[PDB]
Amino acid sequence: TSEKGKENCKKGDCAFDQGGYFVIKGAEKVFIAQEQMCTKRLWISNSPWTVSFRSENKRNR
């Protein structure tokens, strides 16, 4: 369905559909964005007063 011109415009493949989901077993699945902490930043916390360097590829903390 990507870059469909006049062929799939009325061939029964879209009905108010944006096309951003997955088909697994006939049910539509969607990814929810997970907010993770930034690894490219010197994280400083308290109790205990520490500063950390995060892993780029291997666990080199």
Partner 1 sequence: VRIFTDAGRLLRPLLVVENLQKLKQEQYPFDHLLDHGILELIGIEEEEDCNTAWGIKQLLKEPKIYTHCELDLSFLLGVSCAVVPFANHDHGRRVLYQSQKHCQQAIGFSSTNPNIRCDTLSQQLFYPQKPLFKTLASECLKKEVLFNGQNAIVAVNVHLGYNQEDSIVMNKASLERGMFRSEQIRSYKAEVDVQFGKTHDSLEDDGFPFIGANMSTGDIVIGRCHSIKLKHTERGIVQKVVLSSNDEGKNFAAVSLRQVRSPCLGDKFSSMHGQKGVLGYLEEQQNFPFTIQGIVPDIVINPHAFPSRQTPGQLLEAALSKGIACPIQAYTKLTRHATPFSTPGVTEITEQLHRAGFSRWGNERVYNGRSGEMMRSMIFMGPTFYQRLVHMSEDKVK
Partner 2 sequence: QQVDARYPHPSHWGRVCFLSTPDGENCGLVKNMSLLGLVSTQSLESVVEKLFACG
Partner 3 sequence: MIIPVRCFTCGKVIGNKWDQYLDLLQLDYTEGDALDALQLVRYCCRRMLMTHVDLIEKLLNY
| 18 near partner 2, judged by CB under 8 A | no
Per CB under 8 A, the list member of 5, 29, 31, 36 interacting with partner 1 is 36
Give the shortest CB-19-to-partner 3 separation in angstroms. 14
Task: Fill in the amino acid letter for 14.
Answer: C
Task: Fill in the amino acid letter for 23.
Answer: V
Integer Cα distance of 61 and 53 in angstroms: 6
Residue 44: phi, psi to the nearest 5? -115, 125
Q: Of the ranges 11-19, 26-34, 36-44, 48-56, which one interacts with partner 3 (CB under 8 A)?
A: 11-19
Binding positions for partner 2, rule: CB under 8 A: 32-35
